[PDB]
Amino acid sequence: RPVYIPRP
Amino acid sequence: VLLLDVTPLSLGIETMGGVMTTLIAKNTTIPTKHSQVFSTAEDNQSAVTIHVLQGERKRAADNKSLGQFNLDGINPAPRGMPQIEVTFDIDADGILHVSAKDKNSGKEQKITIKASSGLNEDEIQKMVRDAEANAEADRKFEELVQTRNQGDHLLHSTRKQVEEAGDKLPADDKTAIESALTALETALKGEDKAAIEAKMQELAQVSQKLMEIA
């Protein structure tokens, strides 16, 4: 499951 | 040895959906260092904010914020393609070094968080007990976020494929897809995980002609 950082 | 220098709580960052993702586990002996590659959650994002957290709660807002910083200069690309390597490094000084590095632009930003930051011994135990006392609610939130994020990717991919499809998509289907997209978007705002799942399935139901066009 790849993970993502939120948009600032 | 009779003693060990260890992390009394998890250390990590906020990730998409408002969850804490752990980089250094609770009860890790120091020195330690861990890196992981992350990406962007939407098309063309030019910068990211790394929000550093300490604690054991699944919702990032319920953890102790240790700091944050930006990494900018990310080249615009489809979501999930940029490679943002985030490193947590704690040596014997108990200073937490956090860096984020864009493996394409080569740009890098770093901060240090002194040994005295984060929760004291009393706050550490309270945090451990609060985690325990809210375990139930925390796990539901984790599952809801995973479902939200999956629905969000489906929403946005479907919207891209509608754009690429153009007048090739029948007006009839275009209108039915747009409806399902709106319903899923609505379900995403809520806290009902099964409802999001039913809206994902309902949108894939009306997308058959769309999927063939692609």
Short mmCIF file of all heavy atoms in Angstrom, two decimals, chain B residues 112-176:
data_model
loop_
_atom_site.label_atom_id
_atom_site.label_comp_id
_atom_site.label_asym_id
_atom_site.label_seq_id
_atom_site.Cartn_x
_atom_site.Cartn_y
_atom_site.Cartn_z
N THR B 112 16.13 20.04 12.74
CA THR B 112 16.49 19.28 13.95
C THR B 112 15.54 19.59 15.09
O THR B 112 15.08 20.72 15.22
CB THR B 112 17.91 19.59 14.39
OG1 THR B 112 17.92 20.93 14.78
CG2 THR B 112 18.86 19.55 13.14
N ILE B 113 15.24 18.58 15.88
CA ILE B 113 14.27 18.73 16.95
C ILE B 113 15.03 18.35 18.17
O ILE B 113 15.49 17.24 18.25
CB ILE B 113 13.07 17.78 16.70
CG1 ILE B 113 12.27 18.39 15.49
CG2 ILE B 113 12.19 17.75 17.95
CD1 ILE B 113 11.38 17.34 14.84
N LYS B 114 15.25 19.29 19.09
CA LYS B 114 16.10 19.01 20.27
C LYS B 114 15.58 17.91 21.24
O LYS B 114 14.38 17.58 21.26
CB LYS B 114 16.43 20.33 21.03
CG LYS B 114 15.19 20.97 21.64
CD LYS B 114 15.21 22.49 21.71
CE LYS B 114 14.11 22.94 22.68
NZ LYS B 114 14.37 24.28 23.28
N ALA B 115 16.50 17.35 22.03
CA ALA B 115 16.18 16.27 22.98
C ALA B 115 15.05 16.63 23.95
O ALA B 115 14.26 15.80 24.37
CB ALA B 115 17.44 15.92 23.76
N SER B 116 14.96 17.89 24.29
CA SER B 116 13.94 18.32 25.24
C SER B 116 12.49 18.44 24.66
O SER B 116 11.56 18.65 25.44
CB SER B 116 14.36 19.65 25.81
OG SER B 116 13.87 20.67 24.98
N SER B 117 12.30 18.33 23.34
CA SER B 117 10.97 18.49 22.72
C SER B 117 10.01 17.36 22.98
O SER B 117 10.40 16.31 23.44
CB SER B 117 11.11 18.56 21.20
OG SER B 117 12.05 19.57 20.89
N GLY B 118 8.75 17.52 22.59
CA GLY B 118 7.75 16.46 22.75
C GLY B 118 7.32 16.31 24.22
O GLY B 118 7.61 17.15 25.06
N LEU B 119 6.64 15.23 24.51
CA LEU B 119 5.93 15.11 25.77
C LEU B 119 6.88 14.76 26.90
O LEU B 119 7.84 13.99 26.71
CB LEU B 119 4.90 14.03 25.57
CG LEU B 119 3.94 14.45 24.42
CD1 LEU B 119 3.03 13.27 24.16
CD2 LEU B 119 3.10 15.72 24.75
N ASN B 120 6.62 15.29 28.09
CA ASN B 120 7.33 14.87 29.29
C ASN B 120 6.86 13.49 29.81
O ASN B 120 5.97 12.90 29.23
CB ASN B 120 7.31 15.98 30.36
CG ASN B 120 5.92 16.25 30.93
OD1 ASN B 120 5.09 15.36 31.11
ND2 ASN B 120 5.68 17.51 31.27
N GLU B 121 7.49 12.99 30.88
CA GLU B 121 7.18 11.65 31.39
C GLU B 121 5.71 11.44 31.76
O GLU B 121 5.12 10.40 31.43
CB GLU B 121 8.11 11.29 32.60
CG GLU B 121 9.55 10.98 32.12
CD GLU B 121 10.46 10.48 33.22
OE1 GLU B 121 10.01 9.63 34.02
OE2 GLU B 121 11.64 10.94 33.27
N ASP B 122 5.13 12.41 32.47
CA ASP B 122 3.70 12.37 32.79
C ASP B 122 2.86 12.37 31.49
O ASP B 122 2.00 11.49 31.32
CB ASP B 122 3.33 13.55 33.68
CG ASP B 122 3.43 13.22 35.15
OD1 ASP B 122 4.41 12.60 35.57
OD2 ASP B 122 2.48 13.56 35.91
N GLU B 123 3.12 13.31 30.57
CA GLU B 123 2.38 13.36 29.30
C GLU B 123 2.58 12.11 28.46
O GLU B 123 1.66 11.69 27.78
CB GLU B 123 2.74 14.60 28.48
CG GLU B 123 2.29 15.88 29.13
CD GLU B 123 3.16 17.04 28.74
OE1 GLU B 123 4.27 16.84 28.20
OE2 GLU B 123 2.73 18.16 28.97
N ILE B 124 3.79 11.51 28.52
CA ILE B 124 4.06 10.24 27.83
C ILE B 124 3.15 9.14 28.33
O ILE B 124 2.51 8.49 27.52
CB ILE B 124 5.53 9.82 27.90
CG1 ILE B 124 6.38 10.65 26.90
CG2 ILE B 124 5.72 8.33 27.54
CD1 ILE B 124 7.88 10.61 27.21
N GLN B 125 3.06 8.93 29.65
CA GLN B 125 2.15 7.89 30.15
C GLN B 125 0.66 8.16 29.82
O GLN B 125 -0.08 7.23 29.46
CB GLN B 125 2.37 7.66 31.64
CG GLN B 125 3.83 7.33 32.00
CD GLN B 125 4.10 7.48 33.50
OE1 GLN B 125 3.27 7.10 34.32
NE2 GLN B 125 5.26 8.05 33.86
N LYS B 126 0.23 9.42 29.95
CA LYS B 126 -1.13 9.81 29.61
C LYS B 126 -1.43 9.51 28.14
O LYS B 126 -2.46 8.91 27.81
CB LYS B 126 -1.36 11.31 29.88
CG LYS B 126 -2.79 11.68 30.27
CD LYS B 126 -3.52 12.37 29.13
CE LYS B 126 -4.84 13.05 29.55
NZ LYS B 126 -5.79 12.16 30.29
N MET B 127 -0.51 9.91 27.26
CA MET B 127 -0.61 9.55 25.84
C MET B 127 -0.72 8.01 25.64
O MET B 127 -1.50 7.55 24.80
CB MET B 127 0.56 10.15 25.03
CG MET B 127 0.83 9.50 23.68
SD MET B 127 -0.46 9.83 22.46
CE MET B 127 -0.24 11.59 22.13
N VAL B 128 0.02 7.23 26.43
CA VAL B 128 -0.01 5.77 26.23
C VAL B 128 -1.38 5.29 26.70
O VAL B 128 -2.01 4.42 26.08
CB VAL B 128 1.14 5.05 26.95
CG1 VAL B 128 1.04 3.52 26.87
CG2 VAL B 128 2.50 5.52 26.41
N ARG B 129 -1.87 5.88 27.77
CA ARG B 129 -3.17 5.44 28.30
C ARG B 129 -4.32 5.96 27.44
O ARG B 129 -5.34 5.27 27.32
CB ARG B 129 -3.39 5.82 29.76
CG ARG B 129 -2.60 4.98 30.77
CD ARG B 129 -3.03 5.33 32.19
NE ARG B 129 -3.19 6.77 32.36
CZ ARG B 129 -2.24 7.60 32.79
NH1 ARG B 129 -1.03 7.13 33.13
NH2 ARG B 129 -2.49 8.90 32.89
N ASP B 130 -4.17 7.18 26.90
CA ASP B 130 -5.19 7.72 26.00
C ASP B 130 -5.30 6.87 24.75
O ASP B 130 -6.41 6.60 24.28
CB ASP B 130 -4.93 9.19 25.65
CG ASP B 130 -5.26 10.12 26.80
OD1 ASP B 130 -6.00 9.66 27.68
OD2 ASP B 130 -4.79 11.28 26.84
N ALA B 131 -4.15 6.41 24.25
CA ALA B 131 -4.13 5.52 23.08
C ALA B 131 -4.93 4.28 23.40
O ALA B 131 -5.96 4.00 22.76
CB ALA B 131 -2.72 5.19 22.63
N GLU B 132 -4.50 3.58 24.44
CA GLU B 132 -5.29 2.45 24.97
C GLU B 132 -6.84 2.72 25.07
O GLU B 132 -7.66 1.96 24.50
CB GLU B 132 -4.75 2.07 26.36
CG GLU B 132 -3.39 1.39 26.38
CD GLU B 132 -2.76 1.33 27.79
OE1 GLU B 132 -3.35 1.87 28.77
OE2 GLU B 132 -1.65 0.75 27.94
N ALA B 133 -7.22 3.78 25.81
CA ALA B 133 -8.63 4.13 26.07
C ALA B 133 -9.39 4.44 24.76
O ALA B 133 -10.61 4.24 24.67
CB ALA B 133 -8.74 5.30 27.05
N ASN B 134 -8.70 4.92 23.73
CA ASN B 134 -9.40 5.26 22.51
C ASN B 134 -9.09 4.30 21.39
O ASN B 134 -9.35 4.66 20.24
CB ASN B 134 -9.05 6.68 22.06
CG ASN B 134 -9.56 7.73 23.01
OD1 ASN B 134 -10.71 8.14 22.92
ND2 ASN B 134 -8.70 8.18 23.95
N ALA B 135 -8.57 3.09 21.70
CA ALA B 135 -8.02 2.17 20.65
C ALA B 135 -9.07 1.90 19.60
O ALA B 135 -8.81 1.93 18.44
CB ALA B 135 -7.54 0.87 21.24
N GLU B 136 -10.27 1.63 20.09
CA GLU B 136 -11.48 1.37 19.32
C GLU B 136 -11.73 2.40 18.18
O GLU B 136 -11.74 2.08 16.99
CB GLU B 136 -12.62 1.37 20.37
CG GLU B 136 -14.04 1.32 19.85
CD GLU B 136 -14.44 -0.09 19.42
OE1 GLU B 136 -13.66 -0.73 18.65
OE2 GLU B 136 -15.53 -0.56 19.84
N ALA B 137 -11.95 3.63 18.61
CA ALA B 137 -12.17 4.79 17.77
C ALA B 137 -10.98 5.06 16.83
O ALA B 137 -11.19 5.42 15.65
CB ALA B 137 -12.41 6.00 18.67
N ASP B 138 -9.75 4.85 17.34
CA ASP B 138 -8.55 5.08 16.51
C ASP B 138 -8.49 4.08 15.34
O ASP B 138 -8.26 4.47 14.18
CB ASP B 138 -7.25 5.02 17.33
CG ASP B 138 -6.96 6.32 18.09
OD1 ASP B 138 -7.83 7.23 18.22
OD2 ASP B 138 -5.80 6.44 18.55
N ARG B 139 -8.76 2.81 15.61
CA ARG B 139 -8.75 1.82 14.54
C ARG B 139 -9.85 2.10 13.51
O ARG B 139 -9.61 1.90 12.31
CB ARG B 139 -8.97 0.46 15.13
CG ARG B 139 -9.02 -0.65 14.11
CD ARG B 139 -9.45 -1.92 14.81
NE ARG B 139 -10.88 -2.01 15.21
CZ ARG B 139 -11.36 -1.98 16.47
NH1 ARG B 139 -10.55 -1.81 17.52
NH2 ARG B 139 -12.67 -2.10 16.67
N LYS B 140 -11.04 2.56 13.94
CA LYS B 140 -12.12 2.84 12.97
C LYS B 140 -11.65 3.98 12.02
O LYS B 140 -11.95 3.99 10.83
CB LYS B 140 -13.46 3.19 13.65
CG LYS B 140 -14.37 1.99 13.90
CD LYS B 140 -15.62 2.29 14.75
CE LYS B 140 -16.36 1.00 15.17
NZ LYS B 140 -17.13 1.13 16.44
N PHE B 141 -10.91 4.92 12.59
CA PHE B 141 -10.49 6.10 11.86
C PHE B 141 -9.46 5.70 10.84
O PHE B 141 -9.50 6.17 9.70
CB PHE B 141 -9.92 7.18 12.78
CG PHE B 141 -9.38 8.38 12.02
CD1 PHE B 141 -10.25 9.26 11.38
CD2 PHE B 141 -8.00 8.60 11.91
CE1 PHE B 141 -9.76 10.35 10.67
CE2 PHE B 141 -7.51 9.69 11.21
CZ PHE B 141 -8.39 10.57 10.59
N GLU B 142 -8.52 4.85 11.25
CA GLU B 142 -7.55 4.31 10.32
C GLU B 142 -8.18 3.58 9.11
O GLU B 142 -7.81 3.80 7.96
CB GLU B 142 -6.55 3.37 11.01
CG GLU B 142 -5.59 2.73 10.01
CD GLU B 142 -4.52 1.87 10.67
OE1 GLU B 142 -3.99 2.31 11.71
OE2 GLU B 142 -4.23 0.77 10.14
N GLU B 143 -9.11 2.71 9.37
CA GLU B 143 -9.83 2.04 8.29
C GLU B 143 -10.65 3.01 7.42
O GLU B 143 -10.70 2.86 6.19
CB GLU B 143 -10.72 0.97 8.90
CG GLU B 143 -9.94 0.12 9.93
CD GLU B 143 -10.70 -1.10 10.46
OE1 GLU B 143 -11.88 -1.31 10.07
OE2 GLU B 143 -10.11 -1.87 11.29
N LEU B 144 -11.30 4.03 8.05
CA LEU B 144 -12.06 5.00 7.29
C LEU B 144 -11.14 5.81 6.39
O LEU B 144 -11.48 6.08 5.24
CB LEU B 144 -12.79 5.98 8.21
CG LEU B 144 -13.33 7.26 7.60
CD1 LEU B 144 -14.57 6.89 6.72
CD2 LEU B 144 -13.84 8.17 8.74
N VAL B 145 -9.99 6.21 6.90
CA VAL B 145 -9.05 6.94 6.08
C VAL B 145 -8.53 6.08 4.89
O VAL B 145 -8.42 6.60 3.77
CB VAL B 145 -7.91 7.60 6.89
CG1 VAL B 145 -6.82 8.13 5.97
CG2 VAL B 145 -8.46 8.76 7.75
N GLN B 146 -8.22 4.81 5.11
CA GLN B 146 -7.75 4.01 4.01
C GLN B 146 -8.80 3.93 2.95
O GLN B 146 -8.49 4.10 1.77
CB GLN B 146 -7.35 2.66 4.50
CG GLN B 146 -6.00 2.77 5.22
CD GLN B 146 -5.57 1.47 5.79
OE1 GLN B 146 -4.38 1.24 5.99
NE2 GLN B 146 -6.53 0.59 6.07
N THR B 147 -10.07 3.82 3.38
CA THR B 147 -11.17 3.78 2.42
C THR B 147 -11.35 5.11 1.71
O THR B 147 -11.54 5.14 0.49
CB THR B 147 -12.49 3.34 3.08
OG1 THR B 147 -12.29 2.07 3.73
CG2 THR B 147 -13.69 3.29 2.01
N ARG B 148 -11.39 6.21 2.47
CA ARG B 148 -11.37 7.55 1.85
C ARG B 148 -10.29 7.76 0.82
O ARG B 148 -10.54 8.37 -0.24
CB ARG B 148 -11.18 8.69 2.85
CG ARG B 148 -12.38 8.92 3.72
CD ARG B 148 -12.08 9.90 4.82
NE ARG B 148 -13.28 10.47 5.45
CZ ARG B 148 -13.21 11.15 6.59
NH1 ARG B 148 -12.03 11.30 7.17
NH2 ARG B 148 -14.31 11.70 7.14
N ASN B 149 -9.08 7.34 1.12
CA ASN B 149 -7.98 7.62 0.19
C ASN B 149 -8.18 6.79 -1.11
O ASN B 149 -7.94 7.25 -2.26
CB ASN B 149 -6.67 7.29 0.84
CG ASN B 149 -6.22 8.36 1.83
OD1 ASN B 149 -6.85 9.44 1.98
ND2 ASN B 149 -5.18 8.03 2.59
N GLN B 150 -8.63 5.57 -0.93
CA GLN B 150 -8.90 4.73 -2.09
C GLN B 150 -10.03 5.34 -2.93
O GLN B 150 -9.94 5.38 -4.17
CB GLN B 150 -9.17 3.28 -1.67
CG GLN B 150 -9.96 2.52 -2.73
CD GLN B 150 -9.77 1.00 -2.66
OE1 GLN B 150 -9.01 0.50 -1.84
NE2 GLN B 150 -10.51 0.26 -3.53
N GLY B 151 -11.09 5.82 -2.27
CA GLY B 151 -12.16 6.49 -3.02
C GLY B 151 -11.71 7.76 -3.70
O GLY B 151 -12.12 8.04 -4.85
N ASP B 152 -10.89 8.55 -3.02
CA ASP B 152 -10.32 9.74 -3.63
C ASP B 152 -9.51 9.44 -4.92
O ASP B 152 -9.67 10.11 -5.94
CB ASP B 152 -9.46 10.49 -2.57
CG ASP B 152 -8.80 11.71 -3.14
OD1 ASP B 152 -7.75 11.56 -3.78
OD2 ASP B 152 -9.32 12.83 -3.00
N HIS B 153 -8.64 8.42 -4.90
CA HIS B 153 -7.90 8.07 -6.11
C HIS B 153 -8.88 7.67 -7.23
O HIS B 153 -8.68 8.01 -8.40
CB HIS B 153 -6.90 6.95 -5.81
CG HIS B 153 -5.66 6.92 -6.73
ND1 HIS B 153 -5.67 7.39 -8.02
CD2 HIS B 153 -4.35 6.43 -6.51
CE1 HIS B 153 -4.43 7.21 -8.59
NE2 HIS B 153 -3.63 6.63 -7.66
N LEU B 154 -9.92 6.90 -6.89
CA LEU B 154 -10.87 6.43 -7.91
C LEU B 154 -11.61 7.64 -8.54
O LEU B 154 -11.71 7.74 -9.76
CB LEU B 154 -11.90 5.44 -7.31
CG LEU B 154 -12.94 4.97 -8.35
CD1 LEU B 154 -12.28 4.16 -9.46
CD2 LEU B 154 -13.95 4.06 -7.63
N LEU B 155 -12.11 8.53 -7.69
CA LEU B 155 -12.74 9.80 -8.11
C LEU B 155 -11.84 10.56 -9.10
O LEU B 155 -12.26 10.90 -10.21
CB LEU B 155 -13.02 10.65 -6.86
CG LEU B 155 -13.93 11.85 -6.72
CD1 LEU B 155 -15.40 11.47 -6.69
CD2 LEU B 155 -13.60 12.65 -5.44
N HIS B 156 -10.60 10.79 -8.70
CA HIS B 156 -9.74 11.57 -9.54
C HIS B 156 -9.26 10.85 -10.78
O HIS B 156 -9.13 11.51 -11.84
CB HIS B 156 -8.63 12.23 -8.71
CG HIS B 156 -9.13 13.38 -7.86
ND1 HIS B 156 -9.27 13.29 -6.51
CD2 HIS B 156 -9.57 14.65 -8.21
CE1 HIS B 156 -9.73 14.46 -6.03
NE2 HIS B 156 -9.92 15.29 -7.07
N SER B 157 -9.08 9.53 -10.74
CA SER B 157 -8.71 8.85 -11.95
C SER B 157 -9.87 8.84 -12.96
O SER B 157 -9.65 9.00 -14.17
CB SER B 157 -8.22 7.42 -11.66
OG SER B 157 -6.98 7.53 -10.93
N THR B 158 -11.09 8.67 -12.47
CA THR B 158 -12.26 8.61 -13.31
C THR B 158 -12.41 9.98 -13.98
O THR B 158 -12.69 10.06 -15.19
CB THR B 158 -13.51 8.24 -12.44
OG1 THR B 158 -13.29 6.93 -11.88
CG2 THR B 158 -14.80 8.19 -13.24
N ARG B 159 -12.21 11.06 -13.21
CA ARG B 159 -12.29 12.41 -13.78
C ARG B 159 -11.27 12.66 -14.86
O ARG B 159 -11.59 13.27 -15.87
CB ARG B 159 -12.16 13.46 -12.71
CG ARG B 159 -13.40 13.57 -11.81
CD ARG B 159 -13.33 14.86 -10.99
NE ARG B 159 -14.45 15.18 -10.09
CZ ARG B 159 -14.34 15.21 -8.75
NH1 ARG B 159 -13.18 14.88 -8.16
NH2 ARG B 159 -15.38 15.52 -7.98
N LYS B 160 -10.04 12.21 -14.67
CA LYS B 160 -9.04 12.26 -15.75
C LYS B 160 -9.50 11.49 -16.97
O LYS B 160 -9.35 11.97 -18.09
CB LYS B 160 -7.69 11.71 -15.31
CG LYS B 160 -6.62 12.76 -15.13
CD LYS B 160 -5.24 12.15 -15.29
CE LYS B 160 -5.04 10.89 -14.43
NZ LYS B 160 -3.72 10.26 -14.74
N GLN B 161 -10.09 10.30 -16.78
CA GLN B 161 -10.37 9.49 -17.94
C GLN B 161 -11.55 10.07 -18.72
O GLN B 161 -11.56 10.02 -19.94
CB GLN B 161 -10.57 8.02 -17.60
CG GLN B 161 -9.27 7.36 -17.16
CD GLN B 161 -9.48 5.95 -16.64
OE1 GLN B 161 -10.10 5.12 -17.31
NE2 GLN B 161 -8.98 5.68 -15.41
N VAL B 162 -12.50 10.67 -18.00
CA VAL B 162 -13.53 11.47 -18.66
C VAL B 162 -12.92 12.59 -19.55
O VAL B 162 -13.31 12.73 -20.71
CB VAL B 162 -14.61 12.02 -17.70
CG1 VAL B 162 -15.56 12.92 -18.47
CG2 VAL B 162 -15.40 10.88 -17.07
N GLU B 163 -11.96 13.36 -19.02
CA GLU B 163 -11.26 14.42 -19.81
C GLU B 163 -10.61 13.87 -21.06
O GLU B 163 -10.95 14.29 -22.16
CB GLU B 163 -10.24 15.20 -18.98
CG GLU B 163 -10.84 16.09 -17.90
CD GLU B 163 -11.94 17.01 -18.42
OE1 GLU B 163 -13.06 16.52 -18.69
OE2 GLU B 163 -11.69 18.24 -18.54
N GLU B 164 -9.69 12.92 -20.91
CA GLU B 164 -9.09 12.24 -22.06
C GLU B 164 -10.13 11.65 -23.02
O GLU B 164 -9.89 11.58 -24.22
CB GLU B 164 -8.11 11.15 -21.62
CG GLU B 164 -6.70 11.67 -21.34
CD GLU B 164 -6.04 11.00 -20.14
OE1 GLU B 164 -6.58 10.00 -19.64
OE2 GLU B 164 -4.97 11.48 -19.69
N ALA B 165 -11.29 11.25 -22.51
CA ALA B 165 -12.28 10.59 -23.36
C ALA B 165 -12.93 11.57 -24.33
O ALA B 165 -13.19 11.21 -25.48
CB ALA B 165 -13.34 9.88 -22.52
N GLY B 166 -13.19 12.79 -23.86
CA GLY B 166 -13.85 13.82 -24.66
C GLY B 166 -15.20 13.38 -25.23
O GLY B 166 -15.91 12.57 -24.60
N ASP B 167 -15.54 13.88 -26.41
CA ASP B 167 -16.87 13.57 -27.01
C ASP B 167 -17.00 12.10 -27.41
O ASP B 167 -18.07 11.66 -27.84
CB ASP B 167 -17.20 14.50 -28.19
CG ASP B 167 -16.02 14.71 -29.13
OD1 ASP B 167 -15.06 13.90 -29.12
OD2 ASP B 167 -16.05 15.69 -29.91
N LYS B 168 -15.91 11.35 -27.26
CA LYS B 168 -15.92 9.90 -27.46
C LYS B 168 -16.87 9.22 -26.43
O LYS B 168 -17.44 8.17 -26.71
CB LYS B 168 -14.48 9.37 -27.35
CG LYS B 168 -14.16 8.16 -28.21
CD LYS B 168 -12.77 8.27 -28.84
CE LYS B 168 -12.77 9.19 -30.07
NZ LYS B 168 -13.69 8.80 -31.19
N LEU B 169 -17.04 9.83 -25.25
CA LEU B 169 -17.98 9.28 -24.27
C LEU B 169 -19.37 9.76 -24.61
O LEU B 169 -19.56 10.98 -24.73
CB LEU B 169 -17.61 9.73 -22.85
CG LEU B 169 -18.41 9.21 -21.65
CD1 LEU B 169 -18.18 7.73 -21.34
CD2 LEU B 169 -18.01 10.05 -20.44
N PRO B 170 -20.34 8.82 -24.76
CA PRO B 170 -21.76 9.15 -24.90
C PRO B 170 -22.25 10.10 -23.80
O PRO B 170 -21.97 9.88 -22.63
CB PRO B 170 -22.44 7.78 -24.74
CG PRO B 170 -21.45 6.84 -25.37
CD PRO B 170 -20.12 7.36 -24.88
N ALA B 171 -23.00 11.13 -24.20
CA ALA B 171 -23.63 12.06 -23.27
C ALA B 171 -24.35 11.34 -22.10
O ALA B 171 -24.04 11.62 -20.95
CB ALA B 171 -24.58 12.98 -24.03
N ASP B 172 -25.29 10.44 -22.41
CA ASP B 172 -25.89 9.47 -21.49
C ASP B 172 -24.90 8.94 -20.38
O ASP B 172 -25.11 9.15 -19.19
CB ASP B 172 -26.36 8.30 -22.36
CG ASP B 172 -27.44 7.44 -21.70
OD1 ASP B 172 -27.11 6.68 -20.77
OD2 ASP B 172 -28.62 7.49 -22.14
N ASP B 173 -23.85 8.22 -20.77
CA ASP B 173 -22.91 7.74 -19.76
C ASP B 173 -22.18 8.84 -18.99
O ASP B 173 -21.97 8.72 -17.76
CB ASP B 173 -21.87 6.79 -20.37
CG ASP B 173 -22.50 5.63 -21.09
OD1 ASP B 173 -23.07 4.73 -20.42
OD2 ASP B 173 -22.44 5.62 -22.34
N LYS B 174 -21.75 9.88 -19.72
CA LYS B 174 -21.05 11.06 -19.15
C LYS B 174 -21.86 11.64 -18.00
O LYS B 174 -21.33 11.86 -16.90
CB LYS B 174 -20.78 12.16 -20.18
CG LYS B 174 -20.08 13.38 -19.58
CD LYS B 174 -19.14 13.97 -20.62
CE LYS B 174 -18.16 14.94 -20.03
NZ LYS B 174 -18.59 16.32 -20.39
N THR B 175 -23.12 11.84 -18.26
CA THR B 175 -24.04 12.33 -17.20
C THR B 175 -24.19 11.33 -16.01
O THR B 175 -24.13 11.76 -14.82
CB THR B 175 -25.37 12.75 -17.81
OG1 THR B 175 -25.15 13.92 -18.62
CG2 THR B 175 -26.38 13.13 -16.72
N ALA B 176 -24.38 10.04 -16.31
CA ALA B 176 -24.46 9.00 -15.23
C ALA B 176 -23.14 8.87 -14.38
O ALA B 176 -23.17 8.71 -13.15
CB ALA B 176 -24.78 7.64 -15.85
#
